[PDB]
Design a protein around this ligand. Structure first.
Ligand SMILES: [Cl-]
Ligand SMILES: [Cl-]
Ligand SMILES: [Cl-]
Ligand SMILES: [Cl-]
Ligand SMILES: [K+]
Ligand SMILES: [K+]
Ligand SMILES: [K+]
Ligand SMILES: [K+]
Ligand code: NA
Ligand code: NA
Ligand code: NA
Ligand code: NA
Ligand code: NA
Ligand code: NA
Ligand code: NA
Ligand code: NA
Ligand code: NA
Ligand code: NA
Ligand code: NA
Ligand code: NA
Ligand code: NA
Ligand code: NA
Ligand code: NA
Ligand code: NA
Ligand code: NA
Ligand code: NA
Ligand code: NA
Ligand code: NA
Lengths: 388, 388, 388, 388
């Protein structure tokens, strides 16, 4: 049989994995090795595993390729390494990238500062407006880069439409699918060429692995492996991290279902709360791109942003008043995590500059975990009531 | 007390480590986490651990900084990531590097193909001839890059002399100290600015970790961390790999002593063997740079190369006739590893091209392990006798 | 706050765990140590952690105590060690135990052969008939021991009724709650004194840990720790195994929901299949103790047994014809596991003897995993059709 | 080839291990699994791995069997579990054991309190006097149990002589060889039937594993596995712990050499110190059984006890004055560990009772690590000078 024929939950559990032929061990063994040995001179010549590859990591790569409906996968040391290994493989001095402006911080730093120092130019545009992507393309443009949903107000990008534009103008589309996971969105099925993830978030899901994955065509992945990883970034994932990620992803389907069920309940609670001015969540019908979200995403996700009445000090008082939600900058963990960017991460950033980046003084971001939603809601209500 | 005052073996065991203040646990705990939590909005702002840092990995970094007599350390996903994170932090389009030609394969690929595609030019020279380094320097030269001892005939580079030349001409000296480990050579003490290692080899020593380390001034390491890793390569080491490397390095002193004691015995055996045309080992007085080696290295190392009579087919027959030595391309493991590059790794490379790279048809490389030297010698004698 | 006040899913995620005070690390650190260090002679005397205890393992013990509504927990090397550490702590030569006959194999061997060789007598009874328990009690009886549901036809034991009988006659009730997990059954809430689990099954859930847990009163657990583990069995759980079990149990609620949802669908499919003579599942209303199950269990479980038409050879042909279900003797894993005891585990056992133990020639046992139920049903239908 | 023919260091590195046939991985894979899968009904019947066995753990067991020159090995959850699994396998109610009085604390508790409650009687004797062993033997005696060297003054037991006595009187000899490791003493070669270790000490050596090992004849080990572990103690070692122990034992030879070299230097320093009344170390010629030690042990060990002038308060002041040595109750770690039993572990024990157990008020125990011996000596001198 072939796991590509089975249902998505079956694939989550089984794809890329099988009992160890040699021993029958069900769990993928942890091949925590640096060295692989040959039986003869001839076997050595023939191979020239390698250790730009590993059996444990191979299982993870194969699984994620199946889940994203891509040909091949490549695991990395971090989400940022997935992104940079991809882009540094594809681009050289003189090349150009059109990127969404609404992207993860480290990605933005890489694109705005690192790439130009290597002679690779980047144009940032509002990717919610596909015409801005088209207008920014140049003969040199190799890649269009997008993230959807995107921080901090969970705006969307129309993957299929953007793919069509990128392709007509001769560029590849790379999509960061971290926020959704393959359970909720499949960019390759909508025309994207390459998908990257931080597995640090939902794919692993257990808050104990930093890692990334790249999924795409065999021809590209081979280059990302044998040139990108081998020569450029050196960002290979350790076998133990691969094993933990394999373990974490076993429950991806059931986790995403619960994250999203909980998040929808919490989003509705927040939308009904008179101390909350705005709630950003793709599952709410007042989301500006609601219908796009319904076509492109199978679930609205486990992340919510919202604005509390009373600005900076109200936000600070609110996060200082929660008892269950944990103050942290991560997402996709089993625990509910909360942050108030204007006081926590963007505190030294000028207030008017924060505003231009969509970060208002009262904006709170919530990564909804697997706790009872009534407990999360009660904690939020407690903190909001105190803060306002 | 301060471990910088203690003897080198004491430092190997204790530097960068202490019982856990919270629990008393002697072993450094494995902080296998992706998420760190704040107690308040204020604590979050104050920090802005981070997860461009980790307590387990910090211990390793601190330990290696002490052992190399450097200010600070930075762990990475691989030796190649240590090298590229370093060089991509230091260099941008228009910059220049003078490199030894006798360097590790992946490093050579990075320098010869990857760097120029980012507008960074590289001149390769024979670093055993410091005048060639001087002559190749340009106003744009940011870095002189060397490895010593160097493959495949274990030639040396005079670190102190090269440092003086690099510095007079305004460049930094980066030394790959993988071959020796800090137990046997300390490039920073000889004027190098930055040391890199693949900890995959001797520092870990147990053949089960891929990883790298960078050691240098705090100001540089901060840039390598907060720009190089964070933005460019994403090549961060997993906490479990850091913990294993901490564990492996506990025995670095006793391992290096035994590796080198065994290697000297084996080298002398080989030098006395009439079927062996040449033996390359810094501990043999006929080594071309023997006296330099005695000043710069505290021990002659655990690696030997030698040429067997009868060229390509003799080398192939020899490695196919060993019973104890394992056929593998790694080094620094507890097991003795052997390889015959002309049949194993460089088989598709043209014979005359192999020759120019110092790889003769009969060249065998040996990474001497911790077995009884009489057993290793007996195995070699058995295989050599058969092969010739 | 106090996690004993929160909802059960919130407890599953958070109970016994908190961010590391020292570092903020969210994941419980892996305290993989054997040695704990003192700051002074006085601190050493004061303590006399210990290493009959460990911070990682403590977190697991505390969590499971909360989930079972018990005072304290004690982790062990295996489910069988949880059972024997418990019983060998409680009993000495001359004591007596009344046990269900329908119990796990290794437990039965311990009780039938090991205990009597230590002068501890055991009477086996049909625990579905509480009167048989009463009748078997003696002045020497220290413990009544039960498992529910019980192999191989998933019969039940009325915990509350049996607890009342045991207590009136001066004995403790020990319940093996492995099959259900605390998510589905809480024996202490029904009057049991001590609960044991193999965490190897559902609590860990990921098929990669062997381990046990004991939950009960502080006074008893202290004896099980400081006498049972320390002196008698030595069966302590490794910190890494505790960490993995903590990680696995994070998803216990969502896993059990999906296991049971899938199992109910599969059980109904099997009950409608004319090639299947019997289906044993607590969720089917024809189960002999259905109403008891509805009072005592919050969900009917993830395990099903059924009898296929055509006896021994049909069962063999059936398990040889599945493509998705894996042939294995475990349960509680994320993968669906199937076994045919009469051909696989009880093959050398006389056919008439198997019958007395409730193992008919056509009996198949199924541990339902997290795959799509349509895929599991299709695989079963395929195999059944072929086999019959 | 057969590693039983090779030198002891070669065996330490290679015995029980080989590159993974399936993948070539040099490191023994970590088979962190609970479940093993069958390919058919027939394969399932045929096996009936098992999970009273595991490939990683098997490698460790095989290695230790080679090192002790025994037929077979069995890994356990702890040293105490190695001991109790052994003795509870061998003995039943009515049986008798003759034991040394000078044995590890937990062992003593098991023998003095646990065994008699199971109807197994124990006679304690001074095993330095083989005539006391002979005189204590009864028709019921199944086992003579000894430890050598033995706490707290490092007295010895003549293994060969005691084996001869035990055997003539029809009993087995079990030796706890933890203190020495197989590198320094081989009890089976001297006539012992079974050797047990806490691998927590020297065999692992890295202070991060609790575990035990049993080595003996295949027939006995099979019973210890399939009855002792399976039915009685449940004390199985986790695969990860086995892997770590395999990793630790790679350096056993070089570690023991350095421990003992350092300990001899320190013992001589202490013997020359006028504030030190006595020094107990088998390497000092004034040791009461010095010549026996020279015949039975290849090295005098890494442990020293000594008495400081000034009794209880001097001992307390001394351990409170060390800066490098760590206060802990373990031994065999890479770090030097120190303890003062009269103030630390035996503080609540009556002074006259401590005396009868060989624990004087001024007795200090030292587990010598891998630091520079000059640093350890300087630290001891510093503390002794202050304390006296
Ligand atoms: Cl929930
Ligand atoms: Cl050796
Ligand atoms: Cl499902
Ligand atoms: Cl030393
Ligand atoms: K983040
Ligand atoms: K290599
Ligand atoms: K089972
Ligand atoms: K001890
Ligand atoms: Na694989
Ligand atoms: Na995370
Ligand atoms: Na990788
Ligand atoms: Na506001
Ligand atoms: Na819920
Ligand atoms: Na640290
Ligand atoms: Na290696
Ligand atoms: Na790192
Ligand atoms: Na030749
Ligand atoms: Na040797
Ligand atoms: Na804890
Ligand atoms: Na299992
Ligand atoms: Na335990
Ligand atoms: Na039948
Ligand atoms: Na489903
Ligand atoms: Na094995
Ligand atoms: Na220890
Ligand atoms: Na075991
Ligand atoms: Na004294
Ligand atoms: Na020394």
């Amino acid at each position: 049989s072939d796991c590509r024929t089975y249902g998505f939950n079956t694939q989550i559990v089984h794809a890329g994995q099988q009992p160890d032929p040699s021993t029958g061990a069900l769990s993928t063994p942890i091949f925590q090795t640096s060295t692989f040995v040959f039986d003869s001179a001839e076997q050595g010549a023939a191979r020239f595993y390698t250790r730009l590859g590993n059996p444990t990591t191979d299982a993870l790569e194969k699984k994620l390729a199946v889940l994203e409906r891509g040909e091949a996968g490549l695991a990395t040391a971090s989400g940022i390494s997935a992104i940079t290994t991809t882009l540094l493989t594809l681009c050289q001095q003189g090349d150009h990238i059109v990127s969404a402006s609404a992207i993860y911080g480290a990605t933005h730093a890489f694109l705005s500062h690192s790439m130009p120092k290597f002679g690779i130019n980047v144009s940032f545009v509002d990717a919610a407006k596909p015409e801005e992507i088209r207008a920014a393309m140049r003969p040199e443009t190799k890649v269009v880069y997008i993230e959807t949903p995107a921080n901090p107000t969970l705006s969307l990008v129309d993957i299929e439409t953007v793919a069509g534009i990128a392709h007509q103008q001769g560029a590849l589309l790379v999509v960061d699918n971290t926020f959704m996971s393959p359970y909720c969105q499949q960019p390759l099925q909508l025309g994207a060429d390459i998908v990257v993830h931080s597995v640090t978030k939902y794919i692993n899901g257990h808050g104990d692995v930093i890692g990334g994955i790249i999924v795409g065509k065999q021809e590209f992945i081979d280059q990302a492996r044998f040139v990108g990883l081998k020569d450029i970034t050196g960002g290979c994932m350790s076998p133990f991290n691969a094993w933990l990620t394999l373990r974490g992803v076993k429950t991806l389907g059931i986790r995403m279902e619960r994250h999203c069920e909980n998040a929808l309940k919490i989003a509705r609670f927040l939308e009904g709360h008179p101390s909350i001015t705005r709630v950003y969540y793709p599952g709410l019908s007042s989301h500006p791109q609601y219908e796009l979200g319904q076509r492109q995403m199978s679930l609205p996700g486990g992340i919510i942003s919202f604005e509390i009445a009373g600005g900076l000090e109200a936000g600070r008082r609110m996060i200082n008043s929660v008892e269950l939600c944990l103050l942290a900058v991560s997402l996709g963990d089993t625990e509910t995590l909360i942050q108030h960017p204007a006081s926590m991460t963007h505190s030294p950033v000028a207030p008017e500059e924060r505003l231009k980046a969509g970060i208002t003084d009262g904006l709170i971001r919530l990564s909804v975990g697997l706790e009872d939603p009534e407990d999360i809601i009660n904690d939020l209500e407690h903190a909001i009531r105190k803060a306002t």
